[PDB]
Amino acid sequence: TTFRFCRDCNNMLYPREDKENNRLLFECRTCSYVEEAGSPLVYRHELITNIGETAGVVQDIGSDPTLPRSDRECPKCHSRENVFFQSQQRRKDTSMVLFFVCLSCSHIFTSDQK
């Protein structure tokens, strides 16, 4: 789904079809470089998504003082310290699942058990 660029000249590659050999050949519209396509997938709309609750993590989230602290442990390092905080996505239907990030194992883990 990614947007490849011509290695000779960093420009947006477009799909165009072979006339007789029946293959998608990503030809550059700037220069004459051409490349066959790995998959017949071209375009993808994705009208439904549920993604974005997790990321935005820096390696020193716990360096900020404002995050609360708890005593549930990381289930890799067993250290009782932690940093917990809710979803990083905000829709009007995002969940009350929580995200728990530790400093010792430096790992993200949740509290869902379904």
């Binding site: 404002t66 995050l67 609360p68 917990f84 905080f85 809710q86």
Partner: protein, 56 residues
């Protein structure tokens, strides 16, 4: 409010009022009380002009 830790829905956090009048308040409850009162005052001061127009 900037005075609690992050991401809480406790009755203190959103600010359910614990105390009665007589023992006093905490400043957070004082602030929320002022919020609800000010909402009552602004809705009254707009609705009086609108109801006067529609009555006339």
């Amino acid at each position: 409010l900037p005075h609690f830790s992050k991401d809480d829905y406790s009755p203190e956090s959103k600010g359910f009022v614990e105390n009665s009048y007589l023992r006093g308040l905490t400043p957070q409850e004082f602030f929320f009380h002022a919020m609800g009162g000010r909402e009552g005052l602004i809705d009254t001061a707009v609705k009086t002009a609108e109801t006067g127009y529609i009555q006339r």
